[PDB]
């Protein structure tokens, strides 16, 4: 299986992830690691696309002690609204993004959690998959 990378490490806080796309790994990092996540945080991302992303969606499922908690879906790129400069890139293009995502602020209650993140396009093709662990 793919290696477990460290998205970040401030103090006792740290966020680990590993790619659950069997075809490839990818590179991800967050810039400030804090309990109090500011809004409009900055990320870094490095990957080669295996699908066109004119339409691109994010699914997030959050887990605690193997049972589940919150599920949502948000669109990143839509035909009538590319939110990001990288929208509408083609399958086969390499990407490096270093910039903001538009997250509202939120805390994270203390506790060890596993988050499962999935980026996919309109045909439900996998663009990227992270099995992530947040450690308090």
């Amino acid at each position: 299986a793919w290696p477990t990378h460290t998205a970040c490490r401030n103090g006792n806080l740290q966020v680990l992830y590993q790619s659950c796309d069997p075809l490839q790994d990818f590179g991800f990092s967050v810039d400030q690691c804090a309990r109090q996540l500011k809004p409009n945080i900055n990320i870094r991302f490095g990957m080669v696309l295996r699908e066109d992303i004119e339409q691109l969606f994010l699914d997030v499922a959050l887990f605690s002690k193997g049972l589940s908690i919150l599920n949502f879906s948000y669109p990143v790129c839509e035909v009538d609204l590319p939110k990001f400069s990288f929208c509408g890139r083609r399958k086969g293009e390499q990407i490096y993004y270093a910039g903001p995502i538009n997250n509202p602020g939120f805390e994270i209650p203390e506790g060890d959690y596993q988050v499962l993140l999935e980026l996919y396009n309109q045909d439900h093709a996998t663009v990227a998959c992270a099995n992530a662990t947040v450690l308090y």
Partner: protein, 599 residues
């Protein structure tokens, strides 16, 4: 192994790490998806076996060399995709051969000098994709064919200036569209686009629109995409910004995600000949009143903004408007009353996902919209529809309120007046299906979606609301937790041909209700069908396509008649691969196709 995506004509070989074309692949192959394989060198020999290719995708195959005469024997090649290859050199005649090569993708191939592209056989090109390269001048080489060029994509490159000399290169083209998205354009020599040959231009993410407009002086464009992105650096549009616009003509402008510094009616001074305006996610809390410079607008898009009352758009400004989109409003949108009253010619209105919630809907809230054909109120907070709630919409043709809870007092008939209405989507509206007069008025409706609502006792009776929409062709009743459908429930439905009962809990006897129908698309996937009694087996055989997938189907002798039927009619059966036995344990998981029983 590759995948036969279509009989002898299309195959997929992606991510297989192949170093050569398989002997498996036949002469008759016309579409080959060959991404993520390993072809360092490409030659006359590489694709000779496959003489009839029409579409060849070599994305990300690590190609370094494309040698001479590679495609000599490939007369019908239409599209070649070379995206993502570290190309070192392409021979002069490397792409000659095809009689009508119309699309070449050279995206992210490392090109910084356009002289690198072999011109020999490009005179039939309709689209050339050069995005994410290391390019800094759109100036094409001399004797580079451009006559049939209709799309020319230059995204995410290093183009900072466009000159008259540069654009003159493209003079042979007709109706050409160019994409400059993600190039930081610092200047354009004025008049570079005077040529009438330019249909559409995109300058996405550009940090100085004044510069752009001044450059496009005296030009005629179908559309101009000047939208920005989240990640793009912060600017602020002004009335001043658009001064250059009234020395040019564009039918369609997009200004997505921008911030207007001091929005006045004066801001739109030069929008007088614009026909479509898109202000999506422009941080608007309203529009100014009395514009006068959107007098000839036909299409306005105000999606993803922050309005509080609908009247704040000041519709007075755009009398000639045909289509109005206010989808995805970011806070409770109060529709008000008589707010769109002035928009006498409106035909499309999308209010979906805009956190709207209304009380005595919708005659007042849709006052005077005599000619509306499409209304979308889906994904909203609850709506109370009165009797004859669209009486002020007699020409409505498609109404969509999916995922918007409807509150209707039995026995009101909310849609009575809508006699020209053919498509109605009430999915997940939590409709009270008791009200036999819910769907009154809709004798001539053609397409009804009642997905994810619910019927008393989990059952559709002899008597029921569908007896008011008799002329239907498409009926969707999926996810209604139906346990049963009475034998006569759908007598009275004269012309059905698409029936979706999937994702309920129906059993085989429920197929009785279908006996009087012929040649439908019948979807019964994900139900609780086990044994299909033989006497009502001809009900299935009377149809065109059947889906019985994801059912706990029975594979004992008690279901023998159904199993011989299924094998006999395999061709008529959709989603066959996922149609498998539950009983007995030995055959659990076995596809019905493969069941071998003796009785």
């Amino acid at each position: 192994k590759c995948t036969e995506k279509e009989g002898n004509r299309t195959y997929n070989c992606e991510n297989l790490g192949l170093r050569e074309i398989p002997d498996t692949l036949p002469n008759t192959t016309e579409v080959l998806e060959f991404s993520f394989n390993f072809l360092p060198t490409i030659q006359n020999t590489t694709f000779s076996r496959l003489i009839n290719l029409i579409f060849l995708d070599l994305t990300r195959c690590q190609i370094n060399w494309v040698h001479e005469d590679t495609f000599q024997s490939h007369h019908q090649l239409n599209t070649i995709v070379l995206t993502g290859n570290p190309l070192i050199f392409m021979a002069e005649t490397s792409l000659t051969g095809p009689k009508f090569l119309k699309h070449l993708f050279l995206t992210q191939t490392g090109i910084s000098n356009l002289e690198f592209i072999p011109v020999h056989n490009l005179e039939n090109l309709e689209s050339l994709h050069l995005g994410s390269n290391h390019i800094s001048s759109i100036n094409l080489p001399e004797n580079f064919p451009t006559q049939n060029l209709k799309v020319l994509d230059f995204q995410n490159n290093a183009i900072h200036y466009i000159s008259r000399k540069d654009t003159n290169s493209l003079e042979q083209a007709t109706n050409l569209s160019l994409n400059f998205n993600g190039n930081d354009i610092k200047g354009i020599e004025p008049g570079a686009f005077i040529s009438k040959i330019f249909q559409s231009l995109k300058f996405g993410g550009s940090l100085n629109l004044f510069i752009i407009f001044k450059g496009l002086q005296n030009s005629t464009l179908q559309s101009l995409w000047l939208g920005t992105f989240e990640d793009t650096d912060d600017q602020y549009l002004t009335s001043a910004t658009f001064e250059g616009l009234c020395d040019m003509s564009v039918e369609s402008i997009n200004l997505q995600k921008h911030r207007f510094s001091d929005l006045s009616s004066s801001t739109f001074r030069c929008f007088t000949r614009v026909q479509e305006l898109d202000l999506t996610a422009a941080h608007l809390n309203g529009l100014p009143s009395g514009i006068e410079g959107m007098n000839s607008l036909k299409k306005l898009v105000l999606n993803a903004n922050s309005f509080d009352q609908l009247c704040q758009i000041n519709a007075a400004s755009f009398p000639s408007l045909r289509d109005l989109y206010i989808k995805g409003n970011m806070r409770k949108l109060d529709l008000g009353t008589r707010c769109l009253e002035k928009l006498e010619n409106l035909q499309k209105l999308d209010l979906s996902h805009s956190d709207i919630e209304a009380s005595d809907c919708c005659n007042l809230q849709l006052k005077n919209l005599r000619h509306l054909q499409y209304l979308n109120l889906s994904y909203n907070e609850p709506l109370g529809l009165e009797d004859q709630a669209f009486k002020e919409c007699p020409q409505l043709e498609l109404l969509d309120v999916a995922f918007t809870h409807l509150h209707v007092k039995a026995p009101h008939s909310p849609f009575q007046n809508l006699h020209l209405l053919r498509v109605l989507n009430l999915s997940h509206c939590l409709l009270d299906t008791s009200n036999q007069h819910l769907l009154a008025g809709l004798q001539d409706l053609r397409h009804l979606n009642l997905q994810g609502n619910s019927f008393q006792d989990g059952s559709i009776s002899k008597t029921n609301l569908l007896q008011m929409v008799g002329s239907l062709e498409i009926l969707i009743l999926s996810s209604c937790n139906l346990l049963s459908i009475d034998q006569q429930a759908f007598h009275g439905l004269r012309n059905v041909n698409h029936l979706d009962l999937s994702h309920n809990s129906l059993t085989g006897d429920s197929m009785d209700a279908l006996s009087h129908l012929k040649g439908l698309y019948l979807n019964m996937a994900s139900n609780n069908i086990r044994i299909i009694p033989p006497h009502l087996l001809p009900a299935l055989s009377q149809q065109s396509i059947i889906n019985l997938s994801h059912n706990p189907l029975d594979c004992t002798c008690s279901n023998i008649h159904f199993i011989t039927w299924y094998k006999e009619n395999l061709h008529k059966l959709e989603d066959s691969e996922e149609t498998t036995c539950a009983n007995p344990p030995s055959l659990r998981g076995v596809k019905l196709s493969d069941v071998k029983l003796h009785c």
